[PDB]
């Protein structure tokens with residue numbers, strides 16, 4: 001079994017990369033792809049509170065992402081890993097660390113302690129980081145889909161750099177500045193090399 | 199202003215004590231009575247998930263009590279304190295520590311770290327612990343099963359460990375006395391604090 005998470009800011013091509021990689025992996029492995037809340041009812045209900053929120057306090061928001069994470073982990077991830085599956089998860093702990101911790105300003109270590117309570121030692125086996133420059137990311141955002149948004153995008157990227165710097169061995173950084181066909185190939189090859197080594 | 203929390207297991211006379219102590223403090227203080235979620239919409243929505251849940255994972259439950267606590271703190275407690283109010287809060291951090299931490303078995307220090315994230319340094323100014331024996335507590339519960347009895351005992355045991363740990367904001371009131379005396383001791387303890 002393998003627990004693989006995918007991380008990156010907006011404009012990293014993450015959605016496209018995960019879907020294409022997953023599609024290729026389904027041929028050779030017992031693999032599932034998911035994201036939080038992922039249809040788990042308690043998680044979907046927590047997510048509705050987050051979306052229905054009016055200027056929600058960032059710590060309440062962090063605690064709700066962490067509660068949704070646990071429900072999804074407990075009801076979807078853990079049962080699949082117990083069946084010997086490769087689990088591909090779109091966003092996990094590192095998303096809370098970069099967005100809530102770094103970009104929102106709660107502090108990475110504080111959001112980590114919160115998330116360690118939620119995951120209870122279930123860290124990913126491998127994390128694919130879709131390493132897109134802020135400039136390429138910005139251009140992908142305007143293309144494929146104000147000024148405060150630009151700075152928030154940069155801080156998310158800066159947040160992911162600090163996370164990798166403090167925990168490199170868990171991470172595999174993929175050049176997301178390349179055309180998406182190449183990002184897909186590099187991500188697939190990185191995963192295959194990991195899966196065939198275990 | 200003052201943030202005063204009330205802690206204790208069921209059967210400690212907590213409801214009666216808070217209401218009566220509120221009735222006496224209002225003469226001299228701008229005081230409010232509250233409990234989480236306390237009408238805060240986001241908190242009420244979180245509480246509905248907790249109550250509507252079926253065999254919910256204890257850590258998700260702990261994280262939801264902590265999320266409801268923050269919403270209540272941010273939208274009710276803090277604005278009340280800013281107005282100069284005495285805030286009487288029925289259950290706060292120590293309840294998560296005794297119930298989720300100790301009695302449910304997650305571990306007190308783990309639930310503390312979770313709750314320190316939620317309160318972000320906003321510890322109570324004073325915490326009234328209504329120190330009732332399990333036996334007196336049990337009798338008060340029946341007046342107002344084996345698994346329930348054992349859970350009640352573990353909650354009390356949990357509060358003993360918490361009180362043993364931190365000794366500054368905690369004030370232990372003998373809740374084995376008749377309720378009139380528990381009310382008087384609690385009121386006098388609060389007055390001594392508010393005056394000094």
Ligand SMILES: Cc1cn([C@H]2CCCN(S(=O)(=O)c3ccc(O)c(Oc4cccc(Cl)c4)c3)C2)c(=O)[nH]c1=O
Pocket residue numbers: 036037046047050051064065068091092095096097099100
């Ligand atoms: C998993 C995760 C995601 N994000 C963001 C990634 C980028 C998109 N945002 S968003 O607020 O625009 C958003 C987009 C789609 C959503 O569907 C959403 O709602 C939730 C998603 C997952 C879990 C929960 Cl509780 C809500 C929020 C979420 C965080 O800030 N922290 C996390 O832990």
Ligand SMILES: Cc1cn([C@H]2CCCN(S(=O)(=O)c3ccc(O)c(Oc4cccc(Cl)c4)c3)C2)c(=O)[nH]c1=O
Pocket residue numbers: 234235244245248249262263264266289290291293294295297298
């Ligand atoms: C504040 C608090 C209370 N409790 C319990 C105290 C005894 C009663 N229980 S209960 O689960 O039986 C319960 C009774 C009535 C309720 O109304 C309730 O729902 C909530 C109360 C406060 C906050 C939230 Cl999110 C739900 C739960 C909650 C905890 O276990 N942890 C805490 O942090």
